[PDB]
Design a protein around this ligand. Structure first.
Ligand SMILES: Nc1ncnc2c1ncn2[C@@H]1O[C@H](COP(=O)(O)OP(=O)(O)OP(O)(O)=S)[C@@H](O)[C@H]1O
Ligand SMILES: Nc1ncnc2c1ncn2[C@@H]1O[C@H](COP(=O)(O)OP(=O)(O)OP(O)(O)=S)[C@@H](O)[C@H]1O
Ligand SMILES: Nc1ncnc2c1ncn2[C@@H]1O[C@H](COP(=O)(O)OP(=O)(O)OP(O)(O)=S)[C@@H](O)[C@H]1O
Ligand SMILES: [Mg+2]
Ligand SMILES: [Mg+2]
Ligand SMILES: [Mg+2]
Lengths: 38, 362, 600, 87, 432
């Protein structure tokens, strides 16, 4: 089906994600993030 | 059940309306105004231009200010179509080879700002091909802001073979003002640009042999058509009638270093697979407002025949509805029962975020 | 091992990623599908706007409707409120390097300085003129009319032994007025161009030099005479612009947006000509609406007939169509490339052969054209009882040269030129097809760009098959038919058109044959309807009890029955066939398919 | 970097990447492309039929057009029965 | 966590070559942007794309790649890669309100995967990361070899990669996703050499065949086979540059290669005693030059391709400097010399997984000849050939391998970070 009765979607925002090389160096990639849904 | 909205935004004119209709309900300039020292859209912004700074949010077919773009969509739903988006699926269109970041950004705005229950993005040229009644071809799409050539085989475009002549409707208006200034009329004001656009869309045509029309234009009482300004005074334009559209075939006259539309079309066919090329020459399709000049198809048939091999069967398709082929292809798509199982649902947006559009819209 | 790698800080890692980002597309189910596209009239712009208009009406001024009937000699134009059209020659004069007379061989065609008259006129034509003479003699002898054996000899000897009289400028009963090409126009426009009667009366030797352009000939766009499609379209636009300014007095162009237009088209139209006319009206003139009606439909609407076989004889075309229940019967349409202009040229050629005094006559020269039309309207006749050696005179008036009077005699040239409609090989058909698709191609489907979309009829193919007995594609078949000029005797064309209309139903043949209606100026020859009824009766002796041919309807001029019918079609409330300005700006020629009252 | 430990890790990552991941993701990608191309082809066949269908003549279309034409013609007979009686 | 979407890493994949340069995002079946490596120069301005090469008074055509398939000019390389990766593949900036006529660092989100030739020397690799990290604000970088990517494009861990490009033909053995450095073998007998064979073969014909490019022809009429052309040329106020003329003639030569030329696939070499005599009796293939000139090609169709299989068969170079190819530079010689550089245990594995690549490998009969030559030179082994690519489109091979690689989750531990570079400066030598 389509919508319930409107009601908003959860907001997405450009955050940052820490990720790691096999030689242990840590770097940041920009990534979409949302607050945790109950 | 309710119809989807089909929205076809453009550097010049927004088109909007309900899927299943054969024509838009609404067409208005893609213009927004803010106070110089509240905001306005389309012809209300044109009317009040004295107290506004006026801007186009779409440039060369790509969205370049998302603040102004959001005002245009707000106007389209609530003032033009008189519908709440929360009830209706939305089919949007995008320019060939536009950036991946922009597909995400429009996907966010329909779900977070309009609460569209379901949504799709579609490549303009491919919509125009469906409208033209075929599955394979090459689309010359030429509007206000950009001219693209787009090869398509069995419903799938070939993006490496897409070529982009960075010159179209607005460049020809500015050129027509320059050569009418060389005939002694005065044109350098936004009111005067809207006058010269109205001259171009009535009096201009494409010569079948440009050097022979230059040769014969020296004396013809038939050629020198005339036009009455809003002021009531009268102007008379002659060789300027066919000199303006010649800039599509010779962009040198307009002072830019590029192949014209016939050469760029040949080049796009010659970047495709050898077994595909017969089917591309047999199906050259013309789309967008700048393809409406009288005699254009006849010059394309002659110009592409000079480049192509003598064994090829070149055919130009230019139907009557071709200034709205992109909208019409949208309407047809979004009215198929198959579209219900092709759109991004707002549940998929809740779980996957803006990047869902790359997984689901090709 | 592992803890030494961890001590060096080296460790392989998922980074919490999935195996791959590579997109996994699900297959679309395409079974049991349906569509919602153009399924309801509210979704079709043309029909939505009509429903909105019908509501706005229920919840139009004839003086605001222009009625246009273009042609190869004459344009007829007026408001639907007018009792009668304004008629002008459909011709345009512009400044040029050369006159129409300088660019081409003289008419009628003669091989000047040939060995003998048999070559000069052409041996086939001379044999056919002699055949027609002998057949007329046998016919009127069988009817027991007088035939003096020396009748042609008296004519030839008198014409050969006669010379003109020069008349003093004031003793001439009619001082000619030539068009002053130097004079500034006063119709809200600046270009010194002339239309209609003013253009024909431009002197051949005016100080700035003028050429006359006829944008329509043989009943289709005159591509032969034009160098480009742009020039031809610029002239049909210029002619109709000046006709609205000069015949209808619509001097202020800004006000034209409030007028609508009814255009009369041929029953075998060219879709490119229909689409040119709709584009002139809505893009160049900006009229509010346009509607189209076919010549045969408009003819019956002039009369007030439900069911009729319409014969329309013109300057350059003759058309036959049956009409019934509001529709032209699509298979019945025949369209022949001769008319009353052929009768003018054939009369002049027959008289020139019979030593007619003014041997230097050339129908490409404007005063000679007007003289030949005037001679033909006075003397040519299909009443056989009128015939004897007759003696008359005409004044040759020519620019900057004194009036000359010629006495001349004639005997049968006056009947044999008309009788060409029953042996049309006597007409000069040699150049009619020259230029036929030189600038404007055949109509092809908007989508299926290989398939011809121009109309066809069983009857017109049956006529082409008489001229030339006729795997090939649709373009090859079309191009093969386009090479054949449709020429048939008028009695054979009528009976074949009706036979196709009735599709072998003898009872519809009997109805249509009792309902033949003649219109157009070429039919305006004396005794034409009686002559045509006699010719049909000897070709179908079974139908002689019921063949009935009538000239015009409700006491109108043959030349205006069609315009009167078009003006009724403008007025009547049930007509929803209008293409509105806005529909056309959205969808162009596509809205014709939606709104016309026949399958376009 | 210049040690048997580093060399072993680097080689062991590439061995698993080449043997396990590249072989799986190539099969997924080749099947995915075949689904995408199939989806698009059949959709373009439906959308192109719809674009042309307004042109196809039908029982209903022809009878409604015969009815339009017959009403207009009866209104023209009405027109004369008034004017030819009132004149 | 449960805070993250389907978004992971959007990597840019870059593949520069002597003929073509190709750019795009990973996770996509073909490159979005494909442009000639030949670029226009006019008035200090540099002009990129097949669409911007057009006759003008100053116009000169240059290349930023050498015929070693390596960057010759790092300035020009930076301008070409700026055009593809920044102007074409990212969002634009808006025009000012004063200029629209109504009123009277760039790669921070996308790590870059760059493709190199397998003989690319370490100084060049050092300059690639130096140029990439300084210009564009790229988060992280990777630099990989064309043969590895072509094997992953065929879905293979271990393969023998035959790669027939423009400037070079290469043979190389890949095992467990890595290049066996002893197996690398290279040759000029590739697409650019095949164009010189065709030019030579055309000037050797009894009436010479003269190539004249499409830009020089206004209008042409069809004519019978062997007849002089009914055609009218343009003229220009300015003299045309020899480089421009050459670049435009290479479009005609590429159309001759894709449609006339055929590799002799038949039993034995083309110059075996019966074979050329038989070839003259076959039906030919027709071809039209842009001038309208038209002819049927019979045996010369075979003889231009044969030289990369048999050094005896080749036409002389029209350039008198460009030395004739030797036996050691033919394709069968490179294959034998490549597998002789590998452990005898791997040979049946490698020859069961032959991967063919490079646009010159698309000639009619190429795979049929290769299969026959392998079968006759390694008898009693199963030989099988694989195309690089997901699709019947085989012009992109390395690029699709980069696309698959940079989309694997296990790969994201490999990228050299911005920080990793800033601490070390020449991390490449040890990280690949
Ligand atoms: N009948 C016509 N003849 C010639 N030019 C026309 C005509 N109608 C519109 N145009 C021009 O076409 C342009 C608008 O074309 P569209 O295709 O609607 O523009 P658009 O969709 O905004 O453009 P893009 O390509 O999508 S940015 C303007 O430059 C108009 O002046
Ligand atoms: N009184 C008359 N006697 C004989 N012929 C006449 C008479 N009045 C007009 N005509 C002829 O009628 C012809 C003109 O007929 P029209 O119907 O006006 O032609 P038209 O409509 O321009 O031709 P079409 O129908 O467009 S081909 C000319 O050839 C005249 O010579
Ligand atoms: N279909 C075709 N058949 C044969 N040759 C072709 C075809 N298409 C292109 N070519 C030739 O292919 C060559 C270029 O091959 P590519 O694979 O693009 O070379 P590239 O990758 O730029 O070259 P390198 O070797 O990597 S520097 C040119 O010499 C073209 O003329
Ligand atoms: Mg557009
Ligand atoms: Mg008429
Ligand atoms: Mg390569």
């Amino acid at each position: 089906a389509l919508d319930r009765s409107g009601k908003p979607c959860r907001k997405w925002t450009r955050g940052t994600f820490q990720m790691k090389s096999f030689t242990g160096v840590v770097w940041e990639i920009p990534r979409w993030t949302a607050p945790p849904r109950p | 059940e309710v119809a989807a909205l089909v929205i076809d935004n453009g550097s010049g004119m927004c088109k909007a309306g309900f899927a299943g209709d054969d024509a838009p309900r609404a067409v208005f300039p893609s213009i927004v105004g803010r106070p110089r020292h509240d905001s306005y859209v389309g012809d209300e912004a044109q009317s009040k231009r004295g107290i506004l700074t006026l801007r186009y949010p779409i440039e060369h077919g790509v969205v370049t200010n998302w603040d102004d773009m959001e005002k245009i969509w707000h106007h389209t739903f609530y003032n033009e179509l008189r519908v709440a988006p929360e009830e209706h699926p939305v089919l949007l269109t995008e320019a060939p080879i536009n950036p991946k970041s922009n597909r995400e950004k429009m996907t966010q705005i329909v779900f977070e700002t309009f609460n569209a229950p379901a949504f799709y993005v579609s490549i303009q040229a491919v919509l125009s091909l469906y409208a033209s009644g075929r599955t394979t071809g090459i689309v010359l799409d030429s509007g206000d802001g950009v001219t693209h050539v787009v090869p398509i085989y069995e419903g799938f475009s070939l993006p490496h073979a897409i070529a982009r002549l960075d010159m179209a409707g607005r460049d020809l208006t500015d050129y027509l003002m320059k050569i009418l200034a060389e005939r002694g009329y005065t044109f350098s004001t936004t009111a005067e640009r809207e006058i010269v656009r109205d001259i171009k869309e009535k009096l201009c045509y494409v010569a079948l042999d440009f050097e022979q029309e230059i040769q014969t234009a020296a004396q013809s009482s038939h050629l020198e058509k005339s036009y009455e300004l809003p002021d009531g005074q009268v102007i008379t334009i002659g060789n300027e009638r066919f000199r303006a559209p010649e800039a599509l075939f010779q962009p040198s006259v307009l002072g830019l270093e590029s192949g014209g539309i016939h050469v760029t079309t040949f080049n796009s066919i010659m970047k495709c697979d050898v077994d595909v090329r017969k089917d591309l020459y047999g199906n050259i399709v013309m789309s967008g407002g700048t393809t409406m000049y009288p005699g254009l198809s006849d010059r394309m048939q002659k110009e592409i025949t000079a480049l192509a091999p003598s064994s090829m069967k070149v055919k130009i398709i230019a139907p009557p509805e071709r200034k709205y082929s992109v909208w019409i292809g949208g309407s047809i798509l979004a009215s198929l029962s198959t579209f219900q199982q092709m759109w991004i649902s707002k549940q998929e947006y809740d779980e996957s975020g803006p990047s869902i559009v790359h997984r689901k819209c090709f | 091992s592992e803890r030494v790698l961890a001590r060096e800080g080296l460790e392989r890692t998922d980074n919490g990623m999935r195996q791959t980002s590579w997109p996994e597309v699900q297959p679309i189910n395409q079974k049991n599908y349906y569509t919602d596209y153009m399924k309801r009239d509210d979704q079709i712009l043309s029909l939505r706007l009509q429903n909105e208009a019908n509501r706005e009406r229920l919840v139009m001024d004839p003086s605001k409707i222009i009625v246009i009937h273009p042609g190869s000699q004459n344009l007829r134009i007026g408001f639907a409120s007018d009792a009668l059209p304004k008629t002008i020659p459909m011709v345009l004069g512009t400044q040029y390097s050369q006159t129409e007379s300088e660019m081409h061989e003289a008419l009628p065609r003669r091989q000047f300085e040939g060995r003998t008259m048999e070559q000069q006129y052409g041996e086939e034509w001379v044999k056919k003129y002699q055949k027609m003479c002998s057949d007329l003699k046998v016919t009127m002898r069988a009817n027991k009319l007088k035939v003096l054996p020396n009748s042609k000899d008296l004519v030839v000897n008198f014409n050969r032994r006669t010379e003109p009289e020069i008349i003093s400028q004031h003793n001439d009963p009619l001082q000619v007025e030539w068009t002053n090409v130097n004079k500034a126009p006063e119709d809200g426009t600046t270009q010194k161009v002339f239309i209609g009667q003013q253009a024909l009366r431009i002197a051949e030797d005016s100080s700035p030099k003028y050429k006359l352009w006829w944008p329509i000939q043989h009943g289709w766009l005159n591509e032969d005479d034009y160098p480009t499609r742009a020039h031809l379209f610029d002239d049909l636009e210029m002619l109709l612009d000046r006709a609205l300014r000069r015949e209808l007095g619509l001097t202020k162009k800004a006000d034209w947006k409030q007028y609508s237009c009814v255009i009369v088209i041929p029953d075998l139209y060219d879709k490119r000509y229909v689409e040119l006319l709709l584009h002139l009206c809505i893009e160049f003139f900006d009229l509010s609406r346009v509607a189209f009606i076919q010549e045969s439909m408009a003819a019956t609407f002039g009369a007030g007939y439900t069911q009729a076989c319409v014969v329309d004889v013109g300057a350059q075309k003759t058309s036959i169509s049956c009409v019934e229940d509001g529709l032209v019967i699509e298979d019945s349409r025949v369209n022949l490339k001769y008319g009353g202009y052929d009768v003018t040229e054939t009369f002049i050629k027959m008289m020139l052969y019979d030593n007619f005094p003014y041997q230097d006559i050339n129908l490409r020269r404007r005063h000679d054209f007007l003289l030949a039309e005037e001679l033909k309207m006075k003397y040519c006749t299909l009443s056989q009882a009128n015939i004897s050696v007759q003696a008359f005179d005409f004044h040759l008036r020519a620019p900057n040269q004194p009036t000359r009077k010629y006495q001349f005699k004639f005997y049968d040239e006056v009947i044999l030129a008309p009788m060409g409609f029953y042996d049309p090989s006597i007409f000069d058909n040699s150049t009619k097809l020259r230029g036929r698709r030189k600038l404007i191609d055949r109509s092809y489907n908007a989508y299926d760009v290989d398939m011809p979309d121009d109309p066809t009829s069983s009857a017109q193919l049956a006529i082409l098959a008489m001229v030339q007995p006729s795997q090939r594609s649709a373009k090859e078949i079309a191009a093969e038919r386009d090479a054949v000029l449709p020429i048939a005797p008028l009695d054979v064309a009528i009976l074949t058109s009706i036979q196709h209309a009735a599709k072998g139903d003898e009872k519809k043949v009997r109805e249509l044959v009792g309902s033949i209606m003649v219109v157009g100026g070429g039919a305006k020859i004396p005794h034409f309807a009686p002559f045509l009824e006699e010719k049909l009766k000897i070709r179908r002796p079974d139908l002689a009890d019921r063949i009935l041919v009538s000239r015009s309807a409700r006491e109108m001029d043959e030349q205006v029955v069609v315009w009167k019918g078009a003006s009724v079609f403008a007025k009547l409330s049930t007509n929803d066939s209008w293409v509105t300005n806005y529909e056309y700006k959205m969808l162009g020629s596509r809205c014709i398919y939606m709104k016309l009252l026949w399958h376009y | 970097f210049q040690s048997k430990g580093y060399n072993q890790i680097y080689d062991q990552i590439w061995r698993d990447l080449a043997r396990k991941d590249v072989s799986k993701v190539f099969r997924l990608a080749t099947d995915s492309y075949a689904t995408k191309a199939s989806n698009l082809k059949k959709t373009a066949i439906l959308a192109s039929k719809e674009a042309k269908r307004w042109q196809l003549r039908t029982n209903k279309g022809t009878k409604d057009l015969q009815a339009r034409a017959k009403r207009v013609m009866r209104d023209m007979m009405g027109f004369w029965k008034r004017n030819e009686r009132e004149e | 966590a449960d805070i993250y979407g389907g978004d992971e890493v959007s990597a840019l994949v870059l593949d520069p070559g002597y003929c073509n340069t190709r750019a795009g995002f990973a996770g996509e079946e073909m490159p979005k942007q494909v442009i000639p490596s030949f670029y226009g120069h006019v008035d200090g301005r540099d002009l990129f794309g097949d669409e911007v090469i057009v006759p003008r008074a100053g116009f000169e055509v240059r290349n930023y790649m050498n015929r070693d398939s390596m960057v010759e000019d790092w300035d020009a390389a930076t301008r070409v890669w700026e055009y593809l990766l920044v102007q074409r593949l990212q969002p634009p900036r808006p025009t000012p309100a004063s200029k629209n006529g109504l009123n009277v660092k760039p790669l921070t989100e996308n790590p870059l995967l760059m493709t190199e030739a397998p003989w690319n020397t370490p100084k060049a690799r050092e300059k690639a990361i130096e140029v990439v990290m300084e210009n564009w604000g790229t988060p992280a970088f990777w630099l990989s070899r064309t043969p590895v990517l072509a094997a992953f494009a065929a879905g293979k861990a271990t393969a023998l990669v035959i790669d027939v490009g423009g400037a070079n033909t290469s043979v190389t053995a890949i095992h467990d996703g890595m290049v066996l450095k002893r197996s690398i073998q290279r040759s000029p007998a590739a697409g650019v050499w095949l164009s010189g064979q065709i030019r030579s073969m055309w000037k050797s014909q009894d009436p010479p065949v003269n190539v004249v490019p499409t830009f020089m022809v206004e209008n042409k009429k069809p004519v019978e086979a062997g007849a002089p052309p009914d055609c009218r040329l343009r003229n220009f106020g300015f003299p045309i540059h020899d480089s421009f003329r050459a670049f435009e003639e290479e479009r005609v030569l590429t159309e001759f290669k894709e449609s006339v030329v055929e590799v002799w696939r038949g039993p034995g070499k083309y110059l075996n005693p019966g074979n050329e005599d038989f070839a003259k009796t076959q039906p030919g293939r027709v071809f039209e030059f842009p001038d309208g000139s038209n002819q049927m090609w019979r045996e010369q169709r075979y003889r231009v391709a044969e030289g990369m299989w048999d050094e005896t068969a080749a036409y002389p170079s029209l350039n008198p400097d460009e030395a004739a190819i030797t036996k050691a530079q033919t394709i069968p010689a490179l294959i034998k010399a490549a597998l002789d550089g590998v452990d005898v245990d791997l040979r049946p594995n490698l020859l069961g997984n032959v991967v063919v690549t490079g646009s010159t490998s698309l000639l009619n009969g190429f795979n049929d000849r290769l299969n026959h030559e392998l079968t006759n030179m390694y008898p009693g082994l199963k030989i099988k050939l694989h195309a690089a690519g997901l699709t019947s489109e085989r012009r992109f091979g390395a690029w699709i391998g980069g696309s698959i690689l940079a989309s694997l989750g296990t790969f994201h531990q490999m990228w050299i970070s911005r920080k990793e570079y800033e601490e070390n400066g020449a991390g490449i030598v040890e990280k690949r």
